Design a protein around this motif. Structure first.
Motif, PDB file in Angstrom:
ATOM      1  N   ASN A  74       2.654  -5.556  -6.215  1.00 47.81           N
ATOM      2  CA  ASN A  74       3.348  -6.181  -5.094  1.00 47.81           C
ATOM      3  C   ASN A  74       4.702  -6.725  -5.523  1.00 47.81           C
ATOM      4  OD1 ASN A  74       1.471  -7.215  -2.340  1.00 47.81           O
ATOM      5  ND2 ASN A  74       0.617  -5.879  -3.929  1.00 47.81           N
ATOM      6  N   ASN A 133       8.290  -5.379  -3.710  1.00 41.97           N
ATOM      7  CA  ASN A 133       9.260  -6.115  -2.906  1.00 41.97           C
ATOM      8  C   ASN A 133      10.598  -6.308  -3.608  1.00 41.97           C
ATOM      9  OD1 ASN A 133       8.270  -7.901  -4.805  1.00 41.97           O
ATOM     10  ND2 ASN A 133       7.202  -9.190  -3.314  1.00 41.97           N
ATOM     11  N   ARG A 180      11.590  -8.008  -6.356  1.00 40.48           N
ATOM     12  CA  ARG A 180      11.954  -9.357  -6.769  1.00 40.48           C
ATOM     13  C   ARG A 180      12.850  -9.355  -8.001  1.00 40.48           C
ATOM     14  NH1 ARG A 180       8.775 -14.273  -5.484  1.00 40.48           N
ATOM     15  NH2 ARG A 180       7.256 -12.757  -4.690  1.00 40.48           N
ATOM     16  N   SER A 212      11.515  -2.223   0.310  1.00 34.67           N
ATOM     17  CA  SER A 212      11.288  -3.603  -0.103  1.00 34.67           C
ATOM     18  C   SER A 212      11.832  -4.624   0.884  1.00 34.67           C
ATOM     19  CB  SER A 212      11.904  -3.839  -1.480  1.00 34.67           C
ATOM     20  OG  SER A 212      13.193  -3.267  -1.559  1.00 34.67           O
ATOM     21  N   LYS A 213      12.687  -4.212   1.822  1.00 35.98           N
ATOM     22  CA  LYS A 213      13.185  -5.146   2.825  1.00 35.98           C
ATOM     23  C   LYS A 213      12.066  -5.615   3.747  1.00 35.98           C
ATOM     24  CE  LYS A 213      17.394  -5.361   4.259  1.00 35.98           C
ATOM     25  NZ  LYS A 213      18.528  -6.324   4.257  1.00 35.98           N
ATOM     26  N   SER A 214      11.130  -4.723   4.075  1.00 34.68           N
ATOM     27  CA  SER A 214      10.041  -5.088   4.975  1.00 34.68           C
ATOM     28  C   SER A 214       9.023  -5.997   4.301  1.00 34.68           C
ATOM     29  CB  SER A 214       9.357  -3.830   5.504  1.00 34.68           C
ATOM     30  OG  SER A 214       9.325  -2.817   4.516  1.00 34.68           O
ATOM     31  N   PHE A 215       8.915  -5.939   2.976  1.00 33.99           N
ATOM     32  CA  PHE A 215       7.936  -6.745   2.256  1.00 33.99           C
ATOM     33  C   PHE A 215       8.418  -8.187   2.168  1.00 33.99           C
ATOM     34  CE2 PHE A 215       7.055  -2.475   0.470  1.00 33.99           C
ATOM     35  CZ  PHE A 215       5.730  -2.380   0.845  1.00 33.99           C
ATOM     36  N   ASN A 216       7.605  -9.113   2.669  1.00 32.43           N
ATOM     37  CA  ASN A 216       7.920 -10.528   2.549  1.00 32.43           C
ATOM     38  C   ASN A 216       7.731 -10.989   1.109  1.00 32.43           C
ATOM     39  OD1 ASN A 216       8.645 -13.122   3.372  1.00 32.43           O
ATOM     40  ND2 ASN A 216       6.530 -13.686   3.868  1.00 32.43           N
ATOM     41  N   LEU A 217       8.516 -11.987   0.715  1.00 33.01           N
ATOM     42  CA  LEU A 217       8.492 -12.507  -0.645  1.00 33.01           C
ATOM     43  C   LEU A 217       7.528 -13.673  -0.817  1.00 33.01           C
ATOM     44  CD1 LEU A 217      12.111 -12.399  -2.129  1.00 33.01           C
ATOM     45  CD2 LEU A 217      10.109 -10.999  -2.660  1.00 33.01           C
ATOM     46  N   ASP A 218       6.745 -14.002   0.212  1.00 32.02           N
ATOM     47  CA  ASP A 218       5.807 -15.112   0.142  1.00 32.02           C
ATOM     48  C   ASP A 218       4.346 -14.699   0.240  1.00 32.02           C
ATOM     49  OD1 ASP A 218       8.028 -16.710  -0.014  1.00 32.02           O
ATOM     50  OD2 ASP A 218       7.412 -18.089   1.577  1.00 32.02           O
ATOM     51  N   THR A 219       4.045 -13.523   0.782  1.00 29.82           N
ATOM     52  CA  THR A 219       2.677 -13.058   0.945  1.00 29.82           C
ATOM     53  C   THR A 219       2.461 -11.780   0.148  1.00 29.82           C
ATOM     54  OG1 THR A 219       2.923 -11.560   2.837  1.00 29.82           O
ATOM     55  CG2 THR A 219       2.869 -13.925   3.302  1.00 29.82           C
ATOM     56  N   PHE A 234       4.441 -21.254  -1.854  1.00 32.89           N
ATOM     57  CA  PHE A 234       5.144 -20.119  -2.439  1.00 32.89           C
ATOM     58  C   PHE A 234       4.595 -19.872  -3.837  1.00 32.89           C
ATOM     59  CE2 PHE A 234       7.927 -23.908  -2.480  1.00 32.89           C
ATOM     60  CZ  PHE A 234       7.888 -24.225  -3.822  1.00 32.89           C
TER      61      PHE A 234
END
Lengths: 49, 255, 324, 323
Positions: free
Chosen positions: D129, D133, D135, D163-170, D262
């Motif tokens: 993951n 995304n 990171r 990776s734009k669609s992937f949230n960075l918190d979930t 987070f």
RNA sequence: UUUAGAAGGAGAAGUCAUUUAAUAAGGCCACUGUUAAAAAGUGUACCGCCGGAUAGGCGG
């Protein structure tokens, strides 16, 4: 202990260091501009023993 | 009984002992002379019956086991000590003593005396040479062994020659001040141990390596030396180190 | 005879040079090689070490600048190459000092009995087995894809090995190349020859831009405690004592071997610097075994003779306990 | 088992290499690439730092020469390309040094229990993951139009990510490619395999002649004064440990997690420099947690096992002060 | 017959956020590159036959 050729024979030689000469060399090179090498690798306990 | 010259060309030695009482770097000349004498003994054990007169050293490459500091000085390395005999044999970590190691690419010029010196001597010296250590360092490889007479067939390199005159005429009250002043005014000379003092009376002692020889304590004595190229050499006999024994002296000299 | 001589000292019968590191491509591994260089590195970490509660609650969130060095592949090569060499010397001529004469005669007689009995074949086979499985790679062996080892003796090139198939725990005594090389090793240990020279070249495929692990030097300096790697004429390499330690990991005859079941290097007390406990503390140490072999002249099982000969091959200072 | 071994240490099971920077065009990103060099720069600023009033009254209007380095794209390329790779090694065959044998047996037994219990699927899913995304772009993630990431194993080229669609918190658990790659990663971690090689190539669209942000070298007092950027084989690049810090930002099991909500990078004491608050000071510290897992042989909740195995993946110096 | 003989330094890591180098100008004068040569050393070797031997022999 080493062997040295003396004439036609050999001699057994046992080498001992010089503490006072080492200390004198240390200070004289400390106040000089010769290249020198520090050689710091002796522990305090080994120097005590 | 013919006398010629034998050149051992480009011998690579690693982990040679580079430490003295107050000298770090080039090993003592006594180590090279002892290597020559050990080679002579090993050959004479093979019924060759020849003897070595003088040894000449030609430095080509060198490297100090360590690294140069940011300011410029050298810091040396050491192997991890094993199991020192005596007390604390079972201890996992042992004490560390002062030591230094060097890497050399050096050539040896030898003068020999004996009957029918020819290529058979070269084959014998090639066979018997790969069994000894130079100043405690293992020989990795070597270029070749050659039989030469004159100075023309000599590879490029630098010879170590004893220069005690510069030490003698230096300015200083005592010998150490003369040495440091000579090294201050001249940036080419280097200090090398040359021999051994006596400071003891001969006799028999308990615990020696061989309890039959005459035993006497010693102390390494130090003098000056310098480097010069092969073509600058005048005569082939000038760069020939040899033994010199006296009453209480066990030195080696270029004369 | 009463005790060991006051000055007894052997040499090392298996001399090894310093290894050198080269990088190349696996498909063209027999054509060209490229130098491998060591680069400096600086990092900014946190205070992750264990601390007392006051020091912890003060320095919990401080930065930490540190210095180190690293060596790694390029982006166009995926194979690390290691070249080195071994020199083998006879055991009988390897003794450098023996003050006593009757002790020297007894040592020579016992060595003669051992060579007449077995002939140094077992230790030669074990040494060439430790050569074959590439134990000298240490941390470079992990994560490897293809490990190929070749052995050259004088002017004869033996067929290449495959260290991946060889196990790191057992020992193979039926490989034709292993027996062929061990025959020469046992002959050189025997004294029939005068020296032996072995040239070893090892290729390991780890992938592009991966990491290699050369030897780390021991240094002492002021205001510099960073990691320093062993540079050999500019390129990376390994210490001779690092390679020699891996070769002599053949001792499987220590007490309680059936419990741990891994070979260890050969020391006087059987102590290895990975368990922190000597495997031969008092009753299987080399000193008393060689005392019972020589002074009492009492016959011992073949395992103890193997261990004693392995100790004699390594060399050391086996003199008596010194007195003031 | 009464205490920790005096020489306990671990290696790392996720070997990451240095990244390299290339520039290209988004319509021809599969056909050509160009090197991205680091340029020197010198600037003339003003004395804008906070000063005592006495010095401020006398050198407020002085110039200030400074040196720096910058890395920017060309006028005809708008896409930044980043190439790197990961090597995965088994967790059990990564324990470097240990004195006591019983401690090694206990560690192996606990690792086998965790393998039979979970199978290394959660940590593998979280790692892929963090790969997905993007990171690892750090400051290059801001202000990007299209970010895409592909992953190549051996010769099997998986379909591209977004990776734009992937949230960075979930963390997701239902993507087909993510689960498929995490299966191989978990198998390598458990020990069913012996090594894994993964190659990652990322394309970032930011515009023509924009700015990229490679890693900045650390300089000490003796070194020259000024900003120095990281050069890798001539071109710009990123440090291995900078990328590794982004991959292991999976810790969501610390206390007071619901208050902040987070993930944080997996540290020994749970320190996070993004917000400057320690999160595992005493009770949930790794040293206290592993002292109950081994010495007391007390069972822990699965979250503590997750955190302990995540720490053991990274490795470190877990020694003892010679008890 | 060698300051002889002996040796695993090893694991872990976020450097970094900012910026105006800037104004002026005379490179100047004079000068001798010239004397001799062979592209020439055969300057290329082709149509055929017996050969069923990619052997080896012959006609202009």
């Amino acid at each position: 202990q080493v062997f040295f050729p003396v004439g036609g024979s050999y001699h057994l030689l046992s080498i001992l260091p010089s503490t006072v000469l080492n200390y004198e060399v240390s200070d004289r090179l400390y106040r000089s501009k010769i290249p020198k090498i520090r050689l710091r690798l002796l522990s305090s306990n080994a120097a005590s023993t | 009984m013919m006398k010629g010259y034998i050149l051992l060309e480009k011998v690579n030695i690693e982990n040679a002992n580079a430490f003295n009482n107050i000298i770090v770097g080039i090993p003592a000349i006594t180590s090279f002379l002892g290597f020559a004498r050990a080679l002579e003994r090993k050959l004479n054990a093979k019924e060759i019956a020849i003897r070595i007169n003088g040894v000449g050293l030609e430095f080509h490459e060198y490297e100090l086991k360590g690294y140069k500091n940011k300011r410029g000085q050298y810091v040396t390395s050491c192997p991890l000590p094993g199991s020192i005999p005596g007390q604390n044999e079972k201890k996992l970590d042992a004490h560390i003593m002062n030591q230094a190691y060097i890497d050399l690419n050096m050539s040896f010029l030898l003068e020999v005396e004996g009957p029918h010196v020819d290529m058979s001597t070269c084959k014998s010296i090639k066979s018997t040479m790969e069994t000894l250590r130079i100043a405690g360092g293992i020989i990795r490889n070597y270029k070749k062994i050659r039989l030469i007479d004159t100075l023309a067939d000599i590879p490029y390199g630098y010879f170590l020659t004893l220069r005690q005159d510069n030490l003698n005429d230096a300015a200083g009250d005592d010998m150490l001040d003369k040495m440091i002043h000579a090294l201050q005014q001249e940036d080419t000379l280097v200090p090398i141990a040359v021999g051994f003092k006596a400071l003891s009376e001969v006799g028999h002692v308990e615990g020696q390596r061989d309890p039959e020889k005459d035993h006497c304590f010693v102390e390494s004595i130090f003098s000056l030396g310098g480097f010069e190229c092969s073509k600058i050499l005048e005569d082939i006999n000038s760069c020939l180190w040899r033994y010199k024994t006296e009453e209480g002296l066990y030195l080696c000299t270029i004369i | 005879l009463k005790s060991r001589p006051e000055n007894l000292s052997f040499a090392r019968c298996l001399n090894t040079t310093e290894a050198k590191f080269w990088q190349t491509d696996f498909l063209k591994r027999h054509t060209f090689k490229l130098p491998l260089l060591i680069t400096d590195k600086a990092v900014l970490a946190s205070k992750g070490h264990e601390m007392p509660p006051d020091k912890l609650e003060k320095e919990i969130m401080d930065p930490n600048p540190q210095k180190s060095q690293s060596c790694t592949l390029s982006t166009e090569c995926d194979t690390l190459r290691i070249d080195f060499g071994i020199k083998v010397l006879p055991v009988k001529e390897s003794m450098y000092s023996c003050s006593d004469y009757n002790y020297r005669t007894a040592i020579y007689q016992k060595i003669d009995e051992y060579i007449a009995e077995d002939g140094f074949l077992t230790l030669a086979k074990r040494y060439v087995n430790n050569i074959a499985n590439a134990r000298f790679l240490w941390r470079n062996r992990k994560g490897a894809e293809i490990i190929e080892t070749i052995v050259t003796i004088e002017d004869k090139e033996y067929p290449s090995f495959n260290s991946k198939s060889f196990n790191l725990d057992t020992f193979v005594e039926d490989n034709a190349t292993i027996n062929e090389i061990a025959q020469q090793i046992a002959d050189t240990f025997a004294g029939k020859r005068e020296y032996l020279n072995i040239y070893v070249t090892c290729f390991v495929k780890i992938g592009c831009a991966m990491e290699v692990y050369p030897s780390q030097e021991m240094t002492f300096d002021d205001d510099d405690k960073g990691k320093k790697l062993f540079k050999f004429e500019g390129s990376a390499g390994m210490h001779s004592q690092k390679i020699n330690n891996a070769l002599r990991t053949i001792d499987t005859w220590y007490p309680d071997y059936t419990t741990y079941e891994f070979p260890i290097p050969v020391e006087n007390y059987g102590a290895a610097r990975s368990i922190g406990i000597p495997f031969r503390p008092d009753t299987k140490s080399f000193y008393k075994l060689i005392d019972r072999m020589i002074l009492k002249n009492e016959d011992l099982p073949i395992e103890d003779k193997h261990y004693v000969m392995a100790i004699l091959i390594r060399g050391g200072m086996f003199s008596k306990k010194q007195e003031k």
